[PDB]
């Protein structure tokens, strides 16, 4: 009954059917993306509304469709027609991957610019890549994929170690047009192999690793009810899941004695962008949004028990629609589980006598996904004492290029001839605030240096200033890493017992943000990207940091437009956008499978409690 | 046979013979720091000499002495008569702890002071507290410690929940006189009591926890031989242990294929540091070098299976000498085993049908200690893919005050009337580095923004730049995290297979360093601390960024004075010193007992392997 349950296959089936009655899925449509909705601000009705949002794409080219239907009363609420040349095209289909492969080994121009580089073109593989906005005019209000080849020796061979560079194509995949192929030269094709798991290139395997073991023989410490709401070690919690976003987690609160106190109303990792440092033509167009343009939801994998996810693990397996509106379930895509996390609290005190050791667990979900070269761990933490920590893991195979003739300097070398060129991986958090309620305001914190002088006159004090972010236009913020700035959320209405106000410190990793020329395409559609912190009011309507429709959007959508409403952010329900990322120089060891990197953000408690929430932690 | 053995009792027990045949270990003498020496460069020779340096102080006020002795050949090699004003005083002996407040319950000005309070001497425990260097000129050439003042309600009562504040006394331990009784006002002693064992303040306990069951059925892969050589996933190394710095590594390496390689000759931590941030003047001359004037290591606790160290464990139980030159065991003193650690390498391609999924692991070396009111614990990190990584742990009960009345820009409230100072932890890592050998260089990396324009027409190019450190004098740099900034430690003469010298990347946390003014006391004691790495070249006597006596010295010795030499530091042995530290700005839930923060750095492989090291993992 809970009104954040997970989809049901039952609730898709009948979105199908109230589309098709409806006469908005016909046989030329397409399901682009489906997801339920969150109820709005005040639910406190408990009138079940079951609400989906639908983008409807057409095979035949005419316009898409934005719905939104009741699948509780069975009706369409709003149907409106998408000019994409205004407002951005649909996500990718799942069905277009092979489709840019399939138009050029007929169009002539390829296979003159294969033959030229003795290239079988049964042998050559297209990625079917995302097109961003660029100087192609005849682009603006079609849907376009740009295409780069990759050979395979054979079927199960990795195509990713023989890139053909100085080579690309772009494609219209409604009109089936190849409309340019563009050849700068032959490279050479890099011609040793990658496969990861041929015995020639492991050696043999190592024979020195012995079991780990992980058991829990009383079963778990949590608990599952109604398909999707978890209950543990005081943590209360609805585990979500959105084929565009993945795993979001919902009304994140802390049982504190008899008090159920609200944290996090909703978190979610809203967009992530791969934005590619080669000046090349070949590639300087590349920026996937892998989120936002590709779904990272709907290529979540089946994690596998002793494998993705070791010792005691609870699964859900979440339902998503596929492109015609049938029900595909994600069999074991969300692992959840508790894991030891070493030393709690420790101290043996010189004068009590009293020894004092406890031990830290840590709840986890995760998932993880594959889009195309790259696989992501989503792994999201709630720790005993408070924290809330969020972590991705980036492995996969980094995506390849030739390696020219006398070096580059935005290309590392990764084997003879073979190039992976200089990118980030940038991700953005969304986060609705709920600190012990909606009042909620952030202010920055900064390590304060002081002078040798009267009052401090042996030159040893040091403090902190915190500034209150009063509207949305002072709300755009830097990290600082050598003043140490964090953000604190708070809630000036609720006080602690010594009559301060309740918080959460954000504590970020620092990492650079978006490294590319202010004036690029990409810093236009990645603005979220250029900035570290970004808080907004909170309104329905504002979900992501690029805006709904990104696949060819030309820029300026999302979070700069929304904060030039300028309202006002103090004391008032806030979402929280917290920019971080990867900045990738690939190396010798990332080839030919690259070995886990990470990155990510944490929250800790800034006197939400009245004194150490795990006093009441037993000593094991 | 091994060199890097650990000392055993025997070896200390003849130490004390040796000195007591020589002359030097009468009824008057005690040792303030025993340890032994690391083989000089050129030990091919494998002439077994066991070398121990002893610091001998003398409780009538002579001279104390610093000596080498060969345990091996029953010798004196050197014995030097140390004049303390000039090069510093010894380390804090365990049994000065209690000297303190002996003297100063005699004392009548501290008796008048604890009169005024109502407070019963018998119930008034004094910390044994480091003096430094200010302004007191009677304190040259004496050992000074100070203290400051708590109450003990009842014998297992935390004293620190009723800190005394505006009292201090100054004392002579080795004369047996109180030089200064401060007294600048009366406080209230907060009155609440912090016994984080009373039912009364933790509730009941927790009923909801659920065991973790770690166990390894076919015993650990790693092996222990000559009671301390480690040999695990390719990993080599030794494990030491100093009565100062605690567990030392030495002789790091991997085992690649058929060649052993070195990476890293010794590490330790070889100084921390605790400032204090309150400009009052009960505390304003509190720094605490927890290493350098305590010994860390002669505090390491004996850790308890199943509380702190968890899974398959195996032990070491490294010997030390007491202030006679006995030896005492510390049982359990040092915790090994391995841990699983997630995802190592992950993908699933499109084109290949191959599913790929390997899981991670990571050795554990780890001890405990306790300073005081401070407990630490120091895990250094070995994983699979070649990263190396140091954490520490910090826990234990804060230093407080009185919180005053009208606030305080200096000092947190954690319970009514009861502060907590600002202060920092910083640590320096000494890496002895050994890439490939003995001839390294540090290159400093930073990313590289590129401006829109010719050969960059898009504006998405982003590169990085290297820069050779190629004399001490300029090899004192600062973080820069807004442009990524790393160090690079590589072997010129050691190439991987694509012509590219073999190197280790430096991943810092980028936290604050040292706060206070450049003209403190502080600020030029601990020198190291204001800058985040530091490169020497390697000499046997440059141990510690400090200098070897660090109690009471007045300030410059260790790194400013060892970097002046200017010495070349490209392509020779070098060592690299990396500050790291964390800023405590104490919170209501750091009381009464603080859950564990943590800080670090680590290490990853840049270009030392031809390919992934990790292929020959096998699919568990
Ligand atoms: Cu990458
Ligand atoms: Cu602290
Ligand atoms: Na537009
Ligand atoms: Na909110
Ligand atoms: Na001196
Ligand atoms: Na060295």
Redesign the pocket.
């Given at each position: 009954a809970s009104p954040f349950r997970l989809a049901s296959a039952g609730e898709i089936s009948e979105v199908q059917g109230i589309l098709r009655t409806a006469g908005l899925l016909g046989p030329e449509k397409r399901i682009a993306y489906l997801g339920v909705l969150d109820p709005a601000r005040g639910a406190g009705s408990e009138a079940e509304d079951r609400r989906f949002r639908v983008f409807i794409h057409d095979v035949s080219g005419a316009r898409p469709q934005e719905v939104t239907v009741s699948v509780t009363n069975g009706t369409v609420i709003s149907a409106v027609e998408l000019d994409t040349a205004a407002t951005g095209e649909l996500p990718v289909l799942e069905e277009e991957f092979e489709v840019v492969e399939q138009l050029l080994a007929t169009d002539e121009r390829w296979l003159k610019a294969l033959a030229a580089r003795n290239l079988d073109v049964s042998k050559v593989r297209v990625a079917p890549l995302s097109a961003g906005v660029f100087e192609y005019a005849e682009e603006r209000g079609r849907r376009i994929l740009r295409g780069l080849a990759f050979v395979q020796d054979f079927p199960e061979d990795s195509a990713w170690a023989h890139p053909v560079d100085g080579l690309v194509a772009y494609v219209d995949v409604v009109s089936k047009e190849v409309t340019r192929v563009i050849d700068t030269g032959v490279f050479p094709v890099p011609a040793e192999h990658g496969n990861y798991t041929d015995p020639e290139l492991t050696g043999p395997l190592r024979t020195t690793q012995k079991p780990i073991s992980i058991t829990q023989p009383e079963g778990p410490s949590f608990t599952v009810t109604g398909g999707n709401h978890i209950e543990w070690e005081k943590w209360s919690l609805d585990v979500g899941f959105d084929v565009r976003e993945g795993v979001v987690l919902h009304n994140i609160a802390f049982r504190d004695g008899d008090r159920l106190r609200p944290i996090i109303?909703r978190a979610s990792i809203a967009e992530m962008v791969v934005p590619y440092g080669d000046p090349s033509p070949i590639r300087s167009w590349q920026n996937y949004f892998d989120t936002g343009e590709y779904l990272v939801g709907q290529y979540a994998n089946s994690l596998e028990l002793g494998c993705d996810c070791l010792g005691d693990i609870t699964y859900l397996s979440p339902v998503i629609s596929d492109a015609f509106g049938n029900p595909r379930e994600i069999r074991n895509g969300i692992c959840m589980h508790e894991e030891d996390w070493g030393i709690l609290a420790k101290h043996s005190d010189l004068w009590s006598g009293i020894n004092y050791t406890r031990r830290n667990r840590r709840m986890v979900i995760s998932f993880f996904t594959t889009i195309g070269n790259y696989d992501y761990g989503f792994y999201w933490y709630l720790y005993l004492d408070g924290t809330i920590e969020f972590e991705a893991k980036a492995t996969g195979v980094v995506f390849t290029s030739a390696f020219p003739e006398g070096g580059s300097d935005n290309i590392s070398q990764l084997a003879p001839g073979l190039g992976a060129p200089f990118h980030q991986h940038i991700f953005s958090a969304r986060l609705?605030?709920?600190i012990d309620g909606?009042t909620?305001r952030v202010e920055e914190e900064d390590v304060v240096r002081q002078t040798m002088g009267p009052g401090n006159e042996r030159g040893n004090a040091f403090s902190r200033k915190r500034t209150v972010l009063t509207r949305e236009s002072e709300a755009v913020r830097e990290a600082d890493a050598r003043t140490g700035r964090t953000w604190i959320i708070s809630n000036p209405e609720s006080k602690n017992r010594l009559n301060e106000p309740v918080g959460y410190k954000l504590h970020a990793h620092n990492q650079p943000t978006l490294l590319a020329d202010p004036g690029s395409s990409i810093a236009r559609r990645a603005a979220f990207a250029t900035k570290d912190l970004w808080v907004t009011r909170?309104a329905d309507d504002e979900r992501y940091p690029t805006g709904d429709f990104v696949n060819q959007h030309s820029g300026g959508a999302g979070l700069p437009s929304y904060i030039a409403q300028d309202r006002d952010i103090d004391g008032q329900?806030?979402?929280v956008w917290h920019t971080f990322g990867l900045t990738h120089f690939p190396r010798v060891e990332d080839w030919p499978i690259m070995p886990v990197d990470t990155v990510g953000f944490k929250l800790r408690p800034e006197g939400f409690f009245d004194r150490s929430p795990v006093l009441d932690v037993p000593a094991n």
């Amino acid at each position: 009954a809970s009104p954040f349950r997970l989809a049901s296959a039952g609730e898709i089936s009948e979105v199908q059917g109230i589309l098709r009655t409806a006469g908005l899925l016909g046989p030329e449509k397409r399901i682009a993306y489906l997801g339920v909705l969150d109820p709005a601000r005040g639910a406190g009705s408990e009138a079940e509304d079951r609400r989906f949002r639908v983008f409807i794409h057409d095979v035949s080219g005419a316009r898409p469709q934005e719905v939104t239907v009741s699948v509780t009363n069975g009706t369409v609420i709003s149907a409106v027609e998408l000019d994409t040349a205004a407002t951005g095209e649909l996500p990718v289909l799942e069905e277009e991957f092979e489709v840019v492969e399939q138009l050029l080994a007929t169009d002539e121009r390829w296979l003159k610019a294969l033959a030229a580089r003795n290239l079988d073109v049964s042998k050559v593989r297209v990625a079917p890549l995302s097109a961003g906005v660029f100087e192609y005019a005849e682009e603006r209000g079609r849907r376009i994929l740009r295409g780069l080849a990759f050979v395979q020796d054979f079927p199960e061979d990795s195509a990713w170690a023989h890139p053909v560079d100085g080579l690309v194509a772009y494609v219209d995949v409604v009109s089936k047009e190849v409309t340019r192929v563009i050849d700068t030269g032959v490279f050479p094709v890099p011609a040793e192999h990658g496969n990861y798991t041929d015995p020639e290139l492991t050696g043999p395997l190592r024979t020195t690793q012995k079991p780990i073991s992980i058991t829990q023989p009383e079963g778990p410490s949590f608990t599952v009810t109604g398909g999707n709401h978890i209950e543990w070690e005081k943590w209360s919690l609805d585990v979500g899941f959105d084929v565009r976003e993945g795993v979001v987690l919902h009304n994140i609160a802390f049982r504190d004695g008899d008090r159920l106190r609200p944290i996090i109303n909703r978190a979610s990792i809203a967009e992530m962008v791969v934005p590619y440092g080669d000046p090349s033509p070949i590639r300087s167009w590349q920026n996937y949004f892998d989120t936002g343009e590709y779904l990272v939801g709907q290529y979540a994998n089946s994690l596998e028990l002793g494998c993705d996810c070791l010792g005691d693990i609870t699964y859900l397996s979440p339902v998503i629609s596929d492109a015609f509106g049938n029900p595909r379930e994600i069999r074991n895509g969300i692992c959840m589980h508790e894991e030891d996390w070493g030393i709690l609290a420790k101290h043996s005190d010189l004068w009590s006598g009293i020894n004092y050791t406890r031990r830290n667990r840590r709840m986890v979900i995760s998932f993880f996904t594959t889009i195309g070269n790259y696989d992501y761990g989503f792994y999201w933490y709630l720790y005993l004492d408070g924290t809330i920590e969020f972590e991705a893991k980036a492995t996969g195979v980094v995506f390849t290029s030739a390696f020219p003739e006398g070096g580059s300097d935005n290309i590392s070398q990764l084997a003879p001839g073979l190039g992976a060129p200089f990118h980030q991986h940038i991700f953005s958090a969304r986060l609705d605030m709920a600190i012990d309620g909606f009042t909620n305001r952030v202010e920055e914190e900064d390590v304060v240096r002081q002078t040798m002088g009267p009052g401090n006159e042996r030159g040893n004090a040091f403090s902190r200033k915190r500034t209150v972010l009063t509207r949305e236009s002072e709300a755009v913020r830097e990290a600082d890493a050598r003043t140490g700035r964090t953000w604190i959320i708070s809630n000036p209405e609720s006080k602690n017992r010594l009559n301060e106000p309740v918080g959460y410190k954000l504590h970020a990793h620092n990492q650079p943000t978006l490294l590319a020329d202010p004036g690029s395409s990409i810093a236009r559609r990645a603005a979220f990207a250029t900035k570290d912190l970004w808080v907004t009011r909170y309104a329905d309507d504002e979900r992501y940091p690029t805006g709904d429709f990104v696949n060819q959007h030309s820029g300026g959508a999302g979070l700069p437009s929304y904060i030039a409403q300028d309202r006002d952010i103090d004391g008032q329900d806030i979402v929280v956008w917290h920019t971080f990322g990867l900045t990738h120089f690939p190396r010798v060891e990332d080839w030919p499978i690259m070995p886990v990197d990470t990155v990510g953000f944490k929250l800790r408690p800034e006197g939400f409690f009245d004194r150490s929430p795990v006093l009441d932690v037993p000593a094991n």
